Nucleic acid binder design. Structure first.
Ligand SMILES: [K+]
Ligand SMILES: [K+]
Ligand SMILES: [K+]
Ligand SMILES: [Mg+2]
Ligand SMILES: [Mg+2]
Ligand SMILES: [Mg+2]
Ligand SMILES: [Mg+2]
Ligand SMILES: [Mg+2]
Ligand SMILES: [Mg+2]
Ligand SMILES: [Mg+2]
Ligand SMILES: [Mg+2]
Ligand SMILES: [Mg+2]
Ligand SMILES: [Mg+2]
Ligand SMILES: [Mg+2]
Ligand SMILES: [Mg+2]
Ligand SMILES: [Mg+2]
Ligand SMILES: [Mg+2]
Lengths: 162, 272, 294, 312, 43
RNA sequence: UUACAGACUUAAGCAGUGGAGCAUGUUAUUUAAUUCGAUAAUCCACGACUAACCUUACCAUAUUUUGAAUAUUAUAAUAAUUAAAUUAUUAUAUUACAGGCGUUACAUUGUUGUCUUUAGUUCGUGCUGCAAAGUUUUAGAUUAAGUUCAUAAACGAACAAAACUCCAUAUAUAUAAUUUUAAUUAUAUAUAAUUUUAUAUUAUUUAUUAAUAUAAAGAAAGGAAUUAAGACAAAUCAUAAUGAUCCUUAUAAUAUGGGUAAUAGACGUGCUAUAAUAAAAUGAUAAUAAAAUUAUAUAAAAUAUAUUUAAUUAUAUUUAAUUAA
């Protein structure tokens, strides 16, 4: 008998598994951004594997439009504004959506993937919580205070006198 | 034990290399707060054979330091082997970066093989909130590992027809919402980032919702039934987007021209 | 495939069995795994990931981006050695390359002997043991170019076994004089020639040879006479195995042309007694040698 | 293949010394500014002295600042020539040399480790991983700094004939073509070993309807038979052999003079004979080439050392 | 760098940039090209 | 100094420059100052991707003197350490200094402008000449062109390169529960061409060939990056950095105001216009884009005034949504 390779090890060599969406209740939107795609894609694949074992139906990574920033410089330090060099930066974006999951399990996903994050990858998470119209116990500016103080000071009260 | 390096009295009886490892840990962890200890020196003298260092030198090295060793050496002039020939025993720094990449991959592979499966113990069945008792949706935002001002922003969105308002009260609700109501989609959406914490902003939107609902359900003085709904704000938004509202004419469809599935005996025979 | 705990417990460590059991209860046996052609998560080889490789995995206790220990629980307190030595044999020596362990033990004579054996078939042992090399001319020459004066090293050497075989070699190098001598030593061995010697000590009679502007007058000498000739000729005679010789150089005394002229004279201007006898059909007797014969 | 494997290409993230993305652009600018300042500070912590006549200069490369969501790892390569106790004895096992003392304050010191100080400057967990390089010509940055700062007495009155000779016998002149062709043969062999494994696993049959949709070929072991960590990894690793190096000098060493030393290969043939494709780092530097410049000040003034290494 | 001499008393760090400046100051003093003594406000 | 080739030029074509007004840079002159460069090609909307203050480097007046740094030595205030002394921090003081857009790009680092040529250079071996050297056919053929090919006592190797490549384009797979919708899309991976094929003709070094046409197949038609050497001791010490030399109650530092916006002539570069193949109004189920931007914000709709039914334009009031497919 050869050495048995269990399903957990085999899964690592194949595309991440996805759980079917039953109801379609969008619970979270995780957008990942990086200046390079390679770590972004690898990390996105890891998130899908983490969610599967947690029981979270996940979709994506959906590629969002890449943003391009551009800067044009003059190569010479002092004069010669006729030769200009071009520079650019590309923001790569990916969207992973979570469905039909309880808030506690969703927080476990975010905690785990935060602990094992990759270099140069940023993450924004929009959480969607469906609530009742009427809740129990619910869910002054600095400038204004100074104005009141100033209008009580003698340099201002001396005029307001009617 | 973790604290063993702090108890040189307990080092007696440990193997030679373990004592040296505990001697090196006490120096690294204490640094400028390191003071020679007799027990520590006694244990190190027991390793004079594992290292073949004269028992006398150990004592000097233990009290003098690098200077002591330089004296034992007899000089401080060691050949400058900075351009020595390559012995094909180390990798270039650029190849060591590709090995680091592979060390990271294997680290993640190992987590996915043996650590992620353990997360299945925490699976919880989805306790779906009834779509009718929970019509309001609060969107929260979190920028992980960052301080971002927008993290405070909270958004509230609900379908006006799911608020349980009568016909006249529903009309008053939509009139008072003004630009916050989209008749096309029937969505009433209001966001607030005025406060510093999202919890504060969530309550603020909740309180406004209760106030708007109370006013809309109090039709004792005015019901605003004469006032028609104003959609000018929605029209302006629609003009800024492109509308592909054209479909293929149904009377142009020719279903009789579609390809007809052919008979394949092999597939028909392979199924039996 | 799903395996019973018994089988899996005989190959994988106990600490990893719980993960395998949970994975075999969450992934249905009828899962049709698909291959990803965008992202390569797994390595290009098979690995159970049950053992930490000392090189291909992060070193336990070393700080790094994915280190799981707390910052106060690292176990690397010595920094004088490379933490992760190369795997396997411990080297990456390319196939067909040798570690330069010894340098300076290389001998220019042995480098000439190896190269010449591969290029011409001459025996390395003879070159490295039987031959003696003596530089004769070592100077710097220059060529005037548009970029500027390009200097070159010129070396003229003589090699011989002191037993009749002698050769002259020339070499040029723009880098260093040692390279010019190596090329000259290489050239000299290829030009090795045998020279007739009377009684293996001197030449047959007298030679008056003209090589370009050099007039060479060489006279044979009695046993024990020694070499009384131009210094350039002296060195060649030493390598060739000539012990007794007299002579004078007239007109041009250019060292380079004296050496070449001498070698040419020793071959083209000599005739053995045996060759003279056979051509003329006569017996030639060495009176001095017969006087001391039985 | 080359860009789809972590062992055959350099991740583009490594082309930048600060590897970060923050939604808050201001915080990203601040982190970038903090990384330059800490890099300068670390350069000032590399020169150590035991006694007036024992000054040990550690040559440090530029820092690689890996900013993840939860922590910052500051990775740098360093070279140290141990000249105080370079013996065959084990006396170094009973005291901490100055370089070990310096490396132990990065993370090990329990009271004043540099990581905790930096953790407050960055407001995140910080780790420092020093990596020791045993030769000075394995990193272009370290090589330039050594020459610029330590070999001045060799090129301040022209490049010594011995100094240049040492800089030309550092590496044996490997034949780049056979090494390039050996690498391509190994790839073909590995590629042909997996195709044969599947062809056999299919011809041996490891629902006819399901035999037209699924692509699962069979057991992982059979598909990857004879492809293990002991033969695949080390044969596909790239940039493993130094095949070329050029060291330039310039400045005043009363007029500036420039001397250029060029020795070896400045190209890669793995990209010509095979479908593997080259990548440009920062979109202008070839990947095989690593170039760095280091300047210093002498009696006359500023002089620059420009080193370029070609690793294939 | 000035805080390193108290954070890590055991280690002796050398500031090459500062050291270079001090050497240039001594050199100019020896050539007579030093800096004039600064006038005191009391005067 | 010869011949050939190459571009360089010229031609043709479209719209301009040179003329008017204005904008802008420069010169000259003026001024307490009108800061300083750059200033033929290779300066002149250049440095400068914004001079009211600031910026600022200039001028007038007033004011500061170890100054922003490091170290030394004192003095204190403070916290720890150690049995009141020590050490930490902070402030003050002390003196070496700090500081300098002061001079020197013709003393420098780095960067850049301008040009040339790359089958370019070196290395190894072989061969020719006594040798310095040469490496020979060849002043080859061919292409728009290293374009492609052939050849010689030369044969290789290395770089220089070309290319490989990345981009665009075409197609395939994957991803999106097609309400973040643009699926007519987004972005990862891979494929594709340096096109191929036959046919007749015309030349040839006629052969296993070129130039053409012709039919056939194909989405296939464009770009990029970087350097090899050398010259102008070309620009920059005003992006920052270095030596020398000079200032140190001032050539350093701060504040208020002024100047850099002056105006005879001259020059560069732009804008607007001199009317009918062309200008002006109006066009609401709203003809038709792309690429960017919005936490040191982008600002909807509405209302009010100019202002007239309304629209349009400008501003105010108010501040919806979005920190974003
Ligand atoms: K030659
Ligand atoms: K002004
Ligand atoms: K008109
Ligand atoms: Mg709002
Ligand atoms: Mg509008
Ligand atoms: Mg829009
Ligand atoms: Mg001012
Ligand atoms: Mg001003
Ligand atoms: Mg100074
Ligand atoms: Mg000034
Ligand atoms: Mg000038
Ligand atoms: Mg000859
Ligand atoms: Mg659509
Ligand atoms: Mg101006
Ligand atoms: Mg008009
Ligand atoms: Mg429209
Ligand atoms: Mg409006």
């Amino acid at each position: 008998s050869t050495r048995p390779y269990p399903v957990n090890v085999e899964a690592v060599y194949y595309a991440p598994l996805k759980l079917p969406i039953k109801y379609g209740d969008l619970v979270a939107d995780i957008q990942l951004r990086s200046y390079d795609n390679e770590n972004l894609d690898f990390y996105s694949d890891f998130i899908l594997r983490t969610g599967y074992y947690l029981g979270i139906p996940l979709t994506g990574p959906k590629p969002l439009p890449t943003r391009r920033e551009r800067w044009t410089v003059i190569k010479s330090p002092f004069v010669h504004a006729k030769s200009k060099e071009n520079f650019e930066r590309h923001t790569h974006k990916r969207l992973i959506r979570a469905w039909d999951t309880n808030p506690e399990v969703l927080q476990m996903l975010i905690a785990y993937i935060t602990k094992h994050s990759m270099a140069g990858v940023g993450m924004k998470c929009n959480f969607f919580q469906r609530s009742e119209i009427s809740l129990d116990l619910g869910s002054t500016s600095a400038v204004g205070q100074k104005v009141l103080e100033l209008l009580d000071s003698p340099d201002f009260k001396k005029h307001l006198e009617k | 034990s973790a604290d063993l390096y702090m108890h040189p009295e307990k080092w007696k009886g440990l193997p030679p290399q373990r004592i040296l490892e505990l001697y090196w840990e006490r120096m690294a962890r204490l640094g400028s707060e390191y003071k020679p200890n007799k027990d520590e020196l006694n244990a190190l003298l027991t390793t004079s054979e594992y290292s073949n260092v004269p028992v006398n030198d150990i004592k000097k090295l233990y009290h003098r330091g690098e200077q002591g060793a330089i004296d034992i050496k007899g000089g401080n002039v060691n050949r400058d082997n900075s351009l020595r020939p390559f012995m094909f025993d180390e990798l270039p720094s650029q190849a060591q970066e590709l090995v680091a990449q592979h060390r990271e991959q294997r680290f993640y592979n190992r987590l996915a093989a043996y650590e992620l499966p353990l997360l299945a113990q925490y699976r919880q069945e989805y306790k779906r909130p009834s779509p009718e008792s929970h019509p309001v949706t609060y969107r929260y935002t979190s920028y992980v590992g960052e301080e971002h001002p927008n993290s405070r922003k909270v958004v509230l969105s609900v379908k006006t027809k799911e608020l349980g308002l009568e016909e006249k009260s529903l009309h008053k609700f939509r009139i008072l919402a003004r630009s916050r109501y989209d008749h096309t989609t029937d969505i009433f959406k209001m966001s607030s980032d005025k406060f510093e914490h999202a919890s504060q902003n969530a309550r603020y939107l909740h309180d406004i919702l209760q106030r708007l609902l109370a006013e809309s359900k109090d039709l004792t003085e005015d019901d605003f039934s004469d006032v028609p709904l104003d959609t000018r704000h929605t029209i302006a938004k629609s003009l800024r987007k492109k509308k592909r509202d054209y479909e293929f004419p149904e009377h142009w469809k020719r279903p009789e021209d579609a390809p007809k599935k052919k008979f394949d005996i092999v597939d028909q025979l392979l199924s039996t | 495939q799903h395996y019973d705990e018994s089988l899996l417990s005989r190959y994988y460590p106990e600490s990893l069995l719980k993960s395998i059991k949970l994975a075999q209860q969450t992934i249905p046996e009828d899962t049709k795994f698909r291959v990803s052609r965008n992202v390569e998560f797994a390595p290009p080889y098979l690995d159970d990931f049950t053992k930490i490789h000392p090189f291909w995995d992060y070193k336990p206790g070393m700080p790094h981006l994915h280190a799981q220990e707390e910052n106060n629980n690292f176990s690397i307190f010595r920094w004088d050695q490379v933490q992760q030595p190369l795997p396997g044999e411990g080297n990456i020596l390319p196939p067909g390359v040798s570690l330069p362990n010894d340098g300076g033990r290389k001998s220019k004579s042995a480098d000439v002997a190896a190269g010449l054996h591969k290029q011409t078939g001459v025996d390395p042992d003879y070159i490295t043991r039987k031959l003696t090399m003596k530089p004769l001319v070592m100077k710097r020459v220059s060529n005037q170019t548009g970029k500027g004066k390009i200097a070159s090293f010129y070396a003229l050497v003589v090699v011989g076994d002191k037993n009749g075989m002698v050769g002259l070699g020339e070499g040029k190098s723009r880098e260093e004089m040692s390279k010019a001598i190596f090329k000259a030593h290489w050239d000299a061995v290829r030009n090795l020639k045998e020279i007739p010697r009377y009684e293996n000590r001197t030449i047959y009679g007298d030679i008056d040879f003209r090589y370009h502007g050099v007039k060479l007058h060489l006279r044979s000498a009695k046993p024990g006479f020694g070499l009384r000739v131009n210094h350039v000729i002296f060195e060649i005679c030493e390598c060739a195995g000539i012990k007794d010789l007299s002579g004078k150089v007239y007109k041009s005394r250019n060292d380079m042309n004296i050496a070449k002229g001498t070698i040419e004279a020793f071959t083209k201007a000599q005739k053995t007694l045996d060759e003279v006898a056979l051509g003329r059909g006569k017996k030639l007797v060495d009176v001095r040698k017969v006087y001391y014969s039985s | 293949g080359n860009i789809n494997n972590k062992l055959q290409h350099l991740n583009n993230m490594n082309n930048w010394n600060t590897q970060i993305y923050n939604y808050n652009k201001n915080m990203e600018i601040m982190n970038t500014m903090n990384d330059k300042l800490i890099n300068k500070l670390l350069y000032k912590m590399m020169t150590l002295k035991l006694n007036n006549m024992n000054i040990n200069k550690i040559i440090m490369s530029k820092t690689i600042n890996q900013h993840s969501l939860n922590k910052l790892n500051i990775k740098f390569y360093y070279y140290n020539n141990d000249i105080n106790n370079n013996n065959n004895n084990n006396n170094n096992n009973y005291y901490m040399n100055m370089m070990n003392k310096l490396m132990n304050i990065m993370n090990n010191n329990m009271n004043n480790n540099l990581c905790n100080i930096l953790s407050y400057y960055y407001k995140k967990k910080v780790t420092i991983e020093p990596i020791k390089l045993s030769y000075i010509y394995l990193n272009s940055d370290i090589f330039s700094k050594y020459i610029s700062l330590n070999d001045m007495d060799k090129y301040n009155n022209g490049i010594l004939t011995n100094y240049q000779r040492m800089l030309n016998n550092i590496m044996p002149k490997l034949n780049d073509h056979n090494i390039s062709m050996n690498y391509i043969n190994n790839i073909n062999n590995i590629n042909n070993n997996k195709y044969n494994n599947m062809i056999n696993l299919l011809n041996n049959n490891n629902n006819n309807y399901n035999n037209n949709n699924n692509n699962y070929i069979g057991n992982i072991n059979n598909i990857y038979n004879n492809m293990t960590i002991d033969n695949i990894p080390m044969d596909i690793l790239m940039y493993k052999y130094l095949v070329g190096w050029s060291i330039k000098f310039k400045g005043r060493l009363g007029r500036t003079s420039t001397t250029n030393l060029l020795n070896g290969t400045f190209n890669n043939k793995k990209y010509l004979w095979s479908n593997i494709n080259n990548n440009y780092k920062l979109n202008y530097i070839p990947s095989n080439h690593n170039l760095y410049n280091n300047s210093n000040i002498n009696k006359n003034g500023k002089y620059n050392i420009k080193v370029k290494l070609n690793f294939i | 760098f000035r805080h390193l001499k108290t954070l890590y008393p055991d280690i002796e760090f050398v500031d090459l940039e500062e050291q270079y400046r001090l050497s240039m100051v001594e050199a100019k003093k020896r050539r007579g090209k030093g800096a004039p003594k600064k006038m005191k406000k009391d005067a």
